Symmetry: C2
Amino acid sequence: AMATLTEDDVLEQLDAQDNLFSFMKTAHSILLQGIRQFLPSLFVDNDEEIVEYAVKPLLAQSGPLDDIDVALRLIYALGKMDKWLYADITHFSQYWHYLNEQDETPGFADDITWDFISNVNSITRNATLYDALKAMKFAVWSEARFSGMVKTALTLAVTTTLKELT
Amino acid sequence: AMATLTEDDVLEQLDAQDNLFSFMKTAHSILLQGIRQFLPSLFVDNDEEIVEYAVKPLLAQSGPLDDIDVALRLIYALGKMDKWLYADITHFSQYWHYLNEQDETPGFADDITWDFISNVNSITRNATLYDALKAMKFAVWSEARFSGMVKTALTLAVTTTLKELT
């Protein structure tokens, strides 16, 4: 369980990450914490029996909501999340599971990760970012530059994802 | 995971139980199932993405809500349960845990269980039932009769508990 999320120490954390794996590991943790900080808005607020004996154990660490996938499902099931946002976070979660359980070799510039970002709504719906990313992909180019831009895009997805949850 | 609850096959199940332990074991299971059948009213109803991919895994058996204590806490935390009802079910759950983890000897007519029913709101708030139970307790009496009446009262608590959840 982390501290509290600013845009810019999230931005520091993610820029520090120099490979897709570390980035994704760090992203998953940032999103997790983002989601856990949103969880109290699902519940009663103003009654201290409910908070102390129901809400707290429900949100304790290693408790029943300390998993990005059960927590997401709850927010979605309560009608508190738009489908587009739900789809983005579970892709991140799916790719993290993929990288951490099956394979951690794919970098920023790979086929498999280009397909991933082609399905992240917060990336593909920003029209200039994605066009720039396609122009760059399909242009005597540079692997580092394209890689850096891929990291930018992904950082933008988690940033905009974080903004939607407060 | 059980079938679906009528008042009278719940009433059959509980009357079949000839000791407090079996009764409490059966009650805990009936309440559990009562609570699990209420869980879908917490959530989105009319959208099939949400139902199939969020609600279902949330309510699958051995999933994160298949525990009377996390499920209660959720209903309470969403503001969907009155304090009196929440207090009754967690006593039942507390006494069951007590009987199944520390001691299963106490019968219907014991000190420890008289104290239990003295704190069940659905029993003590029915004024004639509780007076009759006190008159009976504090009267050349009968252990079987008082025992049978204690079982009646407890059956009434689970029955009325069940009615409040649909």
